[PDB]
Design a protein around this ligand. Structure first.
Ligand code: COH
Ligand SMILES: [Cl-]
Length: 210
């Protein structure tokens, strides 16, 4: 099978475990509220910011340039979401990374400084293709359960993408057409597993004290 299929197969168990996260299932089923949704997006702003510096570096190196579409950038869209959710830009100087996000960001800075192309693509697949594939569902649940205004949900919609099912097919075809050595390929597949572990840990830190 091509890269896109084995990525899906090798992370399918982690995706199902993520859906059963105590924090995330509580958020999605309506048992939390807007404040907790805002906490999650603050942590996301931190690791999307680090992710996009690593993407900038790997793109500048020439690796997987076509896959690393800048239209996918989420950090400034999240910042505008958060100015609306919090009522001011005051959160920017205030939020601190949870331990999970500290480690996640550390790894993304390691990938940026090593210009580790294969590892970055793994993180790119896990965040952005997950966003593209399920973001509309999550945003709808925040509307339905908590009345979150759509203009605070821009993170879940990609403005510069017209046909969504077509874009996702092309993304997977670019994954399939990536040229990789056997070792690079094992490095990428392992990193995809790690990227799900990191995201699961972020959920665990957010669930603390609840
Ligand atoms: C309840 C909504 C929900 C949650 C909590 C969720 C939790 C997470 C999560 C948490 C840490 C991460 C990193 C991801 C990342 C992904 N998700 Co979702 N996803 C979600 C809704 C979806 C939907 C919808 C799809 C499309 C297929 C499916 O599972 O129905 C999806 C598929 C994916 C894919 C694509 C697999 C492939 O096509 O190769 C990635 C990557 N994901 N997802
Ligand atoms: Cl951005």
């Amino acid at each position: 099978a091509g890269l896109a299929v084995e990525l899906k197969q090798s992370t399918a168990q982690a995706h199902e475990k993520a859906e059963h996260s105590t924090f995330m299932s509580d958020l999605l089923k309506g048992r939390l509220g807007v404040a907790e949704f805002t906490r999650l997006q603050e942590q996301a702003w931190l690791f999307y910011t680090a992710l996009e510096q690593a993407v900038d570096a790997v793109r500048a190196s020439g690796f997987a340039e076509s896959l690393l579409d800048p239209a996918l950038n989420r950090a400034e869209v999240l910042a505008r979401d958060l100015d609306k959710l919090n009522g001011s830009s005051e959160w920017r100087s205030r939020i601190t990374a949870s331990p999970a996000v500290i480690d996640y960001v550390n790894r993304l800075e390691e990938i940026r400084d090593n210009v580790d192309g294969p590892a970055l693509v793994a993180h790119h697949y896990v965040r952005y293709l997950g966003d593209l594939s399920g973001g509309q569902v999550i945003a709808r649940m925040m509307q339905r359960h908590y009345g979150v205004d759509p203009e605070a949900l821009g993170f879940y919609h990609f403005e510069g993408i017209a046909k969504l099912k077509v874009y996702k097919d092309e993304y997977r075809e670019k994954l399939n057409n990536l040229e990789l050595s056997d070792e690079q390929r094992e490095h990428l597949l392992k990193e995809a597993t790690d990227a799900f572990v990191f995201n699961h840990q972020v959920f665990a830190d957010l669930g603390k004290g609840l």
